Amino acid sequence: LTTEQINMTKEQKEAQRAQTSDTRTDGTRVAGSVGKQKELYDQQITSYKRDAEVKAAKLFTDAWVTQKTIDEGLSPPNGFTNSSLDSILTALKNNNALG
Amino acid sequence: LTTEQINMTKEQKEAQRAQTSDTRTDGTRVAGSVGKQKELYDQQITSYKRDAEVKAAKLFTDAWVTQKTIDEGLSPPNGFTNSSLDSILTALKNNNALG
Amino acid sequence: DAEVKAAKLFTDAWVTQKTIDEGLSPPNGFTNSSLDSILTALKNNNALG
Amino acid sequence: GLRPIQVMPVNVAADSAGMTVGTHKWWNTSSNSPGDALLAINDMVKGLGVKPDYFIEANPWETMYMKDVNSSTWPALMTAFESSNKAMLAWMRTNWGNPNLEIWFQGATTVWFGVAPPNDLNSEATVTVRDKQIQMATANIGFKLGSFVPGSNLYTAYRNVESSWIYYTVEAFHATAIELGEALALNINRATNPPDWSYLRPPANLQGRKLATRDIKMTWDNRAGITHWKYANRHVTTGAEISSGILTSPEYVFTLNDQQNAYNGDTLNMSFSVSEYAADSGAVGASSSFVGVVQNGSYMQTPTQLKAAKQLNGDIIFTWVGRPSWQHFWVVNTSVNDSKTVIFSKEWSSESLTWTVAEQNEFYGLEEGGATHVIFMVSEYDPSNGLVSIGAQVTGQAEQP
């Protein structure tokens, strides 16, 4: 039983080493549950940064649509052209397995 | 009873090894509760990335519909054609077991 | 859940065309026969019938 | 029935040695004589004090050598393999003093690469070696077939390394040894009854075609007496297995939806493998693997401006714009009650096509008015090669007159 507790002590050491270090004792990168948890934080960090940009862009596009409805004949920006939207539409179908 | 505790120590070692490692002591991939938990994170990570794209695409399509209602006669993008929507509609029925 | 919300944009761009370009032929996925399969499934799935 | 002490095995293996080719030469081809590897052990064999009784051959290095060289040299190596073994047997049949010395063969083994790996080209190469040692052990005297490694056709039996799977597992040798030892004691030869997967053969050709839709279809020739096949589709770059199963027809399709699940979009590259499957016993034979780029006609120009109009009388006319200098368009028509039944699929030589209402009532069983919604697909076609470019699709209802 003492010999078996040797392996458990080594494994519990790796769990402790998961903090403050990205590599195990042998040097390999951690990839277990803690490794997956860190990846979720990276996606969430990018999501928070991305979420701030989209809401900020809401004000600028809001100030344009109100001009178009009252100043009809104004030329829409090239980013809103027919060709520009096609790339976004194709990506959405491919990203969501729609096609 | 000491012999029985040998097996429990080995199994608890695998639970510790589930972190910082994707393979058990014998080398097989972990597939238990921790393995299922990691898969949920992968789906959630993709969901967060996918959720940022759809809301970003809302602004571009919003700037187009406001043009169509005031500049009737503008040709809609090929991504909004009748044939393009059919692939999406067929997928939704098949994905949700509607048909 | 990601697929259905993504499909919202495409169908939104079509309904706005139908109300302003009346006479446009609706897609075959919105035909009378196509909807019947969905309606029958919903009644059977929810024990409505 | 003899005592365990009375049987004494020895090791005479040489690293990557071959009777015809290898790092260490076991036999000499210029003049029939033992090679340097064999000559380095003949001294201690004579000094052992007991004449050799059984000789075990497991895997000649020629199987690994023929992986890189062209297939035209494969028959040449087989002739040298047979001549060297026959000459080697006759040399030690008299020099070592055993008048009934016997050589026992062990089944050849293939090579894999990666996790859930597809079988490498050695599957097609070792079969020739495998279909060479069998007749040596059943149509000749002096050579015998010892045994086969269990699960040889399965990748799990090797499992010796994460990538480039070559060697066996710890239990594989023990599993092989018990079967090999039984044959030696009972003098039973395996060449009389080869296993089920020995008769199974890899498909002759394996290639993929991308149709007018962005899906890809795999094609391979059928074989008489074969009704099922087992395929294995994996990720092109990461190598992770995507889908696998049993196919009752010698064709497989890679739909667009599946491609949009494995990747963020449809791709032209593909790493695919398939093998004949025996549904009567579940045995799996050698697998043929295809990697690279599937057959495609992307160099052509896609049709544009697809419109469908229904005339006053009832017929539907389809129009499109393309390349007049390449005025060849393959047209596919599909029903609307079911989205898979083909109305017609023909080659066309004009940018416009008329669908008379007479046959519209014929196909749908209608009596008047024809079809209102029609699934239509047109793609630029190449008569010289038969390749089909990515075509533009117009579906369902035609515009009212």
From Swiss-Prot, chain D:
It is found in: Virion. It comes from the Viruses. Coiled coil: none annotated. Assembles to form the non-contractile sheath that surrounds the tail tube. Allows viral attachment to the host by binding the bacterial outer membrane protein NfrA. It is uncommon for short-tailed phages to have a tail tube inside a non-contractile sheath. Interacts with host NfrA receptor; this interaction is essential for viral adsorption to the host. This is Non-contractile tail sheath. The gene is 65. The chain holds residues 783 to 1183 of 1382 of the full protein.
